[PDB]
C-alpha cells in the first residue's frame, strides 16, 4: 500500500466494447491498495473527466482498442487542463495498437504515460500497474480550499476537492466548524438509502434522480454520496456505484464515491454530508451496501430497499431496518413471490408502528422494479418521497411526472413466465426420449427381421412352426406407425440414391473422378440388419430428412456456395468496391457487412474527437438511408441469388429499416427504368409487398449475447427484445420468409475462451429463449421458428467436428416433438467462422493451416455459410492478399479437395457417431444446469454463463502459457531466427453527407421523431415506424430519440 489514498478512474474509450483488459487493471489497483472508481466500458472524454473531476483522483487509466485513441487523449488532456484537473495524470492502455511515434506524441502533449507492448512483457503486466500507482502517490489535501467560500458560491470542483481533505481528515479544525455552522443554517434534506446486498441501491437511486430530473425539469442540485464498504487491509477498494448510474450525467448533479473499512462508518461521513449541505445542493442522498443501520442517524429520512427474496415472514421482525425506514422499497418486483412479500412487509412495518387504525395498503411500502424503464412502482416511491420531503422543509415545483397512486409497480413486460422457467431442462428430456424410443423401436424391428428370417428358414429345411410367426405379428403392432413407414421406404430409398439422377425434375448423383471412379453425393449404408437401418434412420438420416443431421438439405446448392466473406472498411464508397472485389465473377453474391463502432452504438459520426477518430475505422460508416444506398449500389438484394449479412446487435431495428428501404427503393427505380414513367399508387405498393416477400439476408441482432460479455449494448435488454418482437411480427404480417430477423451468435462467445460444448449449449439455449420469448408474446411456432440464423465458431477441438450436426439434430427434434412444429422450423441453418482465437501473431503463416482444417469440417459437416480468416487476423484487418488466401481455402475444398465431391463423408464413422452421441448429451446437460437456474435470464443474473467462460478461458491459458496445450510456432516448434482505417478524406464526406441529409428532411424531422416516441408510449409497433422514419431521419437521430423513451443500458459491474 502506497502512502496517501491513491483514487483512479478506470475506463474503456468511447464504443470501445474491448473491455476485457481494463478489468484487469482494475484488480492490481485494487490488490496494490488503490481506491478505483471503475466506470466500465464506451466511456466518453466528457464522461471520464467529470468523473475523475467529482472523484478529485489521482490518476486516470484509459484503454482503446477501437483506434482514435490520439484524439481521444488528447481531448482528455485539454478538457481537464480546462476545468481545473491537470494535476490528474492520464495513463494510456497496454493495446498494440498504438505505435511508438503516437506514444511519443501523446505523452508529449499532456499524457502521464503510455506504456507500449515492449513495456508489457519487460515490466510484467503487475510492474506497469506498480510503476502507474507510484507515480499518482501524491497527496491531493494541498490543493484543496482553506475558504467555504468557493464552496458554497457553487464551485463543485472546490467541494471535491475540499472533501478528499475532509476525508483524510487534513481540514482545519476551524474549518470543520464553520462548515457544519454553515451547513446547519443551510437546512437541507438529506435522504439515505440503504439496502440488502444485491437489491438493486445503486440501480433504484439512478431511477430516483431520474424522477427528479423529469419532475422538476431539472431545476434541482443533487449531490450523491455512495458509500461502500470495501476499504481492505490493503486500503485497495472498488467504488462500483457510479458504473450503474445514468441520470448523474449533469452539472446539477454531483457524486462522491467514498471507500470506508470493512469493519469500521468512521467518522468522516458526517463532515462530507456537510460539506455537501454547505455547497448549497438541494438534496443530498447518501447510500449504502450489505443491511446496515449506520446511515440512519445521519439522514432526514431513510429508505430500505430490499428483494423479494427475504426467506420467511418471521425474518422481518428481525430486521432492524424496518423498524427505522421512512419508507421501504421491495425492488425488483418482478421476481417470484413479490406480491406476497409485499403484504408481509407493509403488515410488518405497520405493526413495528402499530398503526392499527391504518390499512396495511396505506404503509410507505412500495413495490418497484427500477430495471423496467418509467417503471411507475418507482415514480409510486418518488412521489412518496417527494410529499416527505416537501413537508420536511424544501422547495418543489408542482410536479409534471404524473402523479399516479398506489404501491406497487404494474406488472411488467413478462419474457419468459416462471411457469416455463424449466424449459430448456424439458427439452433435455425431450431429446433423451426420442433417443429410448431410437433404441426401442430398433430392438423391435431387429426382432421382427429375426423371426420372419428364422421362420422362412423352417419352410426350407422342412419342419414348419407358425409360432414364430404369431410372434412376428405382434412386433408389427408394437413398431410405431412413422417407424414402420421409415424401413418401407428404405428399399425404395435405395434405389433412389443408387442411380445417376435423382429422378419431374432431376438431380445428379454421382461425380466421376479423374481416374475414373464414381463419388456418389450422398452414400448409404450396406446394413443388413432392420435394427441397424432404423436406428440409422432415425438418429442420422440422409441430408433433408429428418432429423436432417446430416444437413437440412437434400443436396448441396451447385449455384451458391457456402462461402460469405466479411467485410467493412471506411465510407459506404469504398466497401461497396470490396465487396464488388470479393464476389468478381460469382453468381453468388453473398455479402458480409461490418459497420464502424459509431455506427454499432447507433450514433451519427461528428467532429467531437471521442467520436471523430471511431468513424470508419474498423467497419463501413452507415449514418443514412442515403450511406446504405451507396453501401449496397449495383447489387441487386431482391435477385434470388444474392443474400446480404450484416452484423448489428444494438441498432439492429433501424439498421434492418434502411436494408428493407434499400432493397424496396431498388425496385422502383428499376421500374421508373424500364417504364420510363414512376408507378403509380397501386403499383407502387404491389412493387413494395413483393420486395419484402422475396428480399433475402440476415441481420444478427442477438440481444442476450451482448450481455453475455460483448458489452455492445445500447438499449434496455427488454426493450430490445420488444422491438425484436415488433420486427418478428413484421414479417409475419408481410409474409418476409426469406430475411432472418436474428442470427443466434456464439462466436464472440467462443472468443471470449469457452469451450465448443459450452459455446454451442448457451448458443442453443439463448435460441430456445428466443423461442420461448415469442411463444408467450403470442406468435405460432411456424411463423418465427423459420426466421431464426445460427451463428458458431470452428476451432481445433474434437467436439468442432460435430458441432453443425448436433445442433440440427437437438433442433430438429425438440422442434418437432416439444414446439410441434413443420419442416421448415425443424431445420437449423447455421454460419460457421474459424476460430479467431485460435489464429496467433506468432507465426502468421501456420495460421492457414489451422483455418483450412477448420474449414474442412464446417464444409464436411455440411454447413449453410462459412467465412474463413486471414492468416494476419491476429495483427491487421485482413489485407487485399491477404483475403484472397482466406478465399481460396473455400475455393480449394469446393472445387480441388477430392472427398469433398461427396456431401456426407462424416456419415458412418464410429467417431462421428460416437462424438456426435457425447456432445449432445453434454450439450444436454448444460441445458439442465441452467434451467436449474431460472433459464438463461435467471442464470444471466448469477452471471453464470460470463462466469463458466471467465473459467473455461483460464484453463485454456493456464495450459497453453504451461505447455499442456501444445501451440505450433507459440510455446513449441518456436522459431529460432525470428525475434518477433479511414481516409481523413472519407470522415469528412460522412460529415458532410449527414449535415446535407439533415437538411433535406429538416421540416419532416422532429415530426417524425415524435411519432417514432409516441409508439413506444402507446406500445404500438416499433420497427413499423422505423420503417418510414429511416427515410427522414439519421441512425443517431432515430437512437436519441428512443434513449428518451426507451433508455439506455446500464453497466454491470
Ligand atoms: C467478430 C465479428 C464476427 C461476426 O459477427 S460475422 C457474422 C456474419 N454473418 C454471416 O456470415 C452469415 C449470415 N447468415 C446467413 O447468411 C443465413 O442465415 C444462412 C442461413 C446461414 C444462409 O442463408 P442462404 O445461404 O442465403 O440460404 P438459405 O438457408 O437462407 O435458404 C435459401 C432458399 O434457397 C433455397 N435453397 C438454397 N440452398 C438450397 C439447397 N442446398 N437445397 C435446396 N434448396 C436450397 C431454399 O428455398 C431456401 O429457402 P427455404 O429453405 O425453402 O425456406
Keep these: 500500500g502506497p502512502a496517501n489514498k491513491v483514487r483512479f478512474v478506470t475506463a474503456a474509450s468511447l464504443f470501445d466494447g474491448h473491455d476485457a483488459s481494463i478489468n484487469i487493471m482494475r484488480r492490481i489497483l485494487q490488490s496494490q491498495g488503490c481506491e478505483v472508481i471503475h466506470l466500465g466500458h464506451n466511456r466518453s472524454v466528457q464522461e471520464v473527466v467529470t468523473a475523475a473531476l467529482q472523484e478529485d483522483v489521482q490518476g486516470i487509466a484509459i484503454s482503446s482498442y477501437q483506434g482514435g485513441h490520439v484524439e481521444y487523449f488528447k481531448y482528455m488532456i485539454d478538457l481537464l487542463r480546462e476545468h481545473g484537473g491537470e494535476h490528474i495524470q492520464v495513463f494510456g492502455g497496454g493495446g498494440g495498437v498504438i505505435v511508438p511515434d503516437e506514444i511519443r506524441e501523446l505523452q508529449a502533449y499532456g499524457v502521464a504515460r ?14 506497469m500497474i506498480t510503476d502507474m500507482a507510484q507515480r499518482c502517490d501524491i497527496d491531493l489535501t494541498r490543493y484543496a480550499p482553506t475558504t467555504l467560500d468557493t464552496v458554497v458560491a457553487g464551485d463543485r470542483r472546490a467541494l471535491a476537492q475540499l472533501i478528499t481533505a475532509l476525508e483524510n481528515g487534513k481540514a482545519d479544525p476551524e474549518l470543520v466548524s464553520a462548515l457544519h455552522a454553515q451547513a446547519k443554517a443551510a437546512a437541507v434534506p ?8 444485491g437489491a438493486g441501491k445503486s440501480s433504484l437511486t439512478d431511477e430516483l434522480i431520474r424522477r427528479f430530473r423529469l419532475d422538476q425539469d431539472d431545476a434541482l442540485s443533487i449531490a450523491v454520496i455512495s458509500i461502500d464498504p470495501s476499504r481492505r487491509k490493503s486500503g485497495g477498494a472498488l467504488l462500483g456505484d457510479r458504473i450503474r448510474m445514468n441520470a448523474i450525467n449533469h452539472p446539477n448533479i454531483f457524486m462522491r464515491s467514498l471507500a470506508t473499512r470493512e469493519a469500521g462508518i468512521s467518522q468522516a461521513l458526517p463532515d462530507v454530508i456537510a460539506a455537501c449541505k454547505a455547497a448549497r445542493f438541494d438534496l443530498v442522498i447518501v447510500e449504502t451496501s450489505g443491511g446496515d443501520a449506520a446511515i440512519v442517524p445521519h439522514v432526514d429520512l431513510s429508505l430500505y430497499v430490499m428483494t423479494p427474496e427475504f426467506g420467511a415472514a418471521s425474518q422481518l421482525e428481525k ?16 421476481r417470484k413471490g413479490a406480491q406476497d412479500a409485499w403484504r408481509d412487509v407493509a403488515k410488518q412495518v405497520q405493526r413495528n408502528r402499530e398503526q392499527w387504525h391504518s390499512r396495511a395498503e396505506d404503509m410507505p411500502v412500495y413495490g418497484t422494479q427500477a430495471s423496467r424503464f418509467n417503471d411507475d412502482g418507482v415514480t409510486m416511491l418518488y412521489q412518496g418521497l417527494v410529499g416527505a420531503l416537501g413537508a420536511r422543509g424544501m422547495s418543489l415545483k408542482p410536479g409534471t411526472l404524473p402523479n399516479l397512486e398506489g404501491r406497487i409497480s404494474t406488472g411488467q413486460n413478462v419474457i419468459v413466465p416462471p411457469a416455463r422457467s424449466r424449459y430448456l431442462a424439458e427439452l433435455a428430456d425431450t431429446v433423451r426420449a426420442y433417443h429410448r424410443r431410437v433404441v426401442a423401436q430398433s430392438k423391435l424391428a431387429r426382432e421382427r427381421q429375426q423371426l420372419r428370417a428364422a421362420h422362412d428358414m423352417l419352410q426350407g429345411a422342412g419342419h414348419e412352426s ?16 412413422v417407424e414402420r413407414k421409415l424401413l418401407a421406404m428404405w428399399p425404395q430409398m435405395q434405389q433412389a440414391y443408387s442411380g445417376d439422377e435423382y429422378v419431374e425434375i432431376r438431380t445428379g448423383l454421382i461425380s466421376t473422378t479423374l481416374s475414373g471412379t464414381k463419388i456418389r453425393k450422398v452414400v448409404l449404408p ?10 440409422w434412420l432415425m438418429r442420422e438420416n440422409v441430408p433433408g430428412s429428418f432429423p436432417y443431421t446430416a444437413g437440412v438439405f437434400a443436396f448441396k446448392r451447385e449455384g451458391e456456395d457456402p462461402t460469405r466473406m466479411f467485410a467493412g472498411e471506411g465510407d459506404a464508397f469504398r466497401t461497396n468496391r470490396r465487396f464488388k472485389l470479393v464476389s468478381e465473377g460469382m453468381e453468388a453474391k453473398r455479402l458480409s457487412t461490418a459497420f464502424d463502432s459509431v455506427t454499432l452504438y447507433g450514433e451519427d459520426p461528428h467532429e467531437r474527437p471521442d467520436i471523430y477518430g471511431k468513424v470508419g475505422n474498423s467497419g463501413v460508416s452507415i449514418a443514412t438511408l442515403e450511406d446504405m444506398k451507396v453501401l449496397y449500389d449495383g447489387f441487386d438484394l431482391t435477385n434470388p441469388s444474392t443474400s446480404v449479412s450484416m452484423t448489428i446487435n444494438g441498432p439492429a431495428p433501424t439498421i434492418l429499416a434502411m436494408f428493407m428501404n434499400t432493397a424496396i427503393d431498388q425496385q422502383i427505380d428499376r421500374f421508373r427504368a424500364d417504364n420510363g414513367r414512376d408507378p403509380t399508387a397501386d403499383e407502387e405498393a404491389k412493387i413494395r ?58 462466436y464472440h462467445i467462443a472468443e471470449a475462451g469457452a469451450n465448443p460444448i459450452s459455446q454451442l449449449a448457451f ?66 441453418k447455421y454460419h460457421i467462422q474459424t476460430s479467431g482465437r485460435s489464429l496467433h501473431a506468432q507465426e502468421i503463416d501456420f495460421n492457414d493451416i489451422r483455418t483450412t482444417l477448420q474449414a474442412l469440417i464446417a464444409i464436411y459437416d455440411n454447413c449453410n455459410s462459412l467465412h474463413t480468416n486471414a492468416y494476419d487476423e491476429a495483427i491487421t484487418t485482413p489485407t487485399a492478399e491477404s483475403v484472397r488466401r482466406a478465399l481460396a481455402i473455400q475455393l480449394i475444398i469446393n472445387r480441388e479437395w477430392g472427398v469433398a465431391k461427396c456431401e456426407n463423408p462424416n456419415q458412418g464413422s464410429f467417431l462421428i457417431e460416437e462424438l456426435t452421441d457425447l456432445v449432445e448429451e453434454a450439450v444436454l446437460q448444460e441445458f439442465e444446469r441452467i434451467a436449474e437456474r431460472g433459464g438463461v435470464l435467471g442464470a444471466m443474473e448469477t452471471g453464470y454463463q460470463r462466469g463458466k467462460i471467465q473459467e473455461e478461458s483460464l484453463y485454456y491459458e493456464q495450459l497453453k502459457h504451461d505447455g499442456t496445450l501444445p501451440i505450433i510456432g507459440v510455446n513449441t516448434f518456436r522459431n529460432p531466427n525470428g525475434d518477433p482505417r479511414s481516409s481523413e478524406d472519407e470522415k469528412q464526406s460522412q460529415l458532410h453527407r449527414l449535415t446535407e441529409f439533415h437538411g433535406a428532411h429538416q421540416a419532416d424531422a422532429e415530426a417524425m421523431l415524435a411519432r417514432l416516441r409516441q409508439a413506444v408510449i402507446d406500445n404500438r409497433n416499433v420497427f413499423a415506424v422505423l420503417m ?16 428518451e423513451v426507451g433508455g439506455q443500458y446500464r453497466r454491470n459491474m
Design 763 to 828: 448458443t442453443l439455449a439463448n435460441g430456445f429463449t428466443y423461442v420461448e420469448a415469442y411463444l408467450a408474446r403470442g406468435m405460432h411456432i411456424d411463423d418465427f421458428a423459420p426466421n431464426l440464423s445460427f451463428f458458431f465458431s470452428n476451432g481445433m477441438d474434437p467436439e468442432y467436428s460435430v458441432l453443425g450436426r448436433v445442433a440440427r439434430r437437438i433442433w430438429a427434434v425438440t422442434m418437432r416433438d416439444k414446439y410441434g412444429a413443420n419442416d421448415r422450423s425443424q431445420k437449423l
Design 1028 to 1043: 418510414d422514419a429511416v427515410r427522414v431521419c439519421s441512425l443517431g437521430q432515430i437512437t436519441h430519440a428512443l434513449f
Design 466 to 481: 407358425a409360432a414364430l410367426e404369431t410372434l412376428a405379428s405382434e412386433r408389427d403392432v408394437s413398431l410405431g406407425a
Design 114 to 127: 503510455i506504456y507500449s507492448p515492449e513495456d508489457g512483457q519487460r515490466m510484467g503486466l503487475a510492474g
Design 190 to 197: 438529506v435522504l439515505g438509502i440503504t439496502g440488502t446486498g
Design 319 to 334: 430486521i432492524d431496518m424496518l423498524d427505522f425506514a421512512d419508507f421501504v422499497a421491495i425492488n425488483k418486483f418482478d
Design 526 to 535: 450396406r446394413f443388413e440388419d432392420e435394427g441397424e437401418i432404423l436406428k
Design 689 to 746: 409487398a413483393w420486395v419484402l416477400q422475396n428480399v433475402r439476408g440476415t441481420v444478427q441482432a442477438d440481444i442476450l449475447k451482448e450481455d453475455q460479455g460483448q458489452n455492445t449494448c445500447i438499449f434496455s435488454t427488454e426493450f430490445s427484445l420488444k422491438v425484436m418482437g415488433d420486427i418478428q411480427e413484421y414479417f409475419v404480417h408481410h409474409q418476409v420468409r426469406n430475411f432472418y430477423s436474428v442470427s443466434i451468435s456464439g
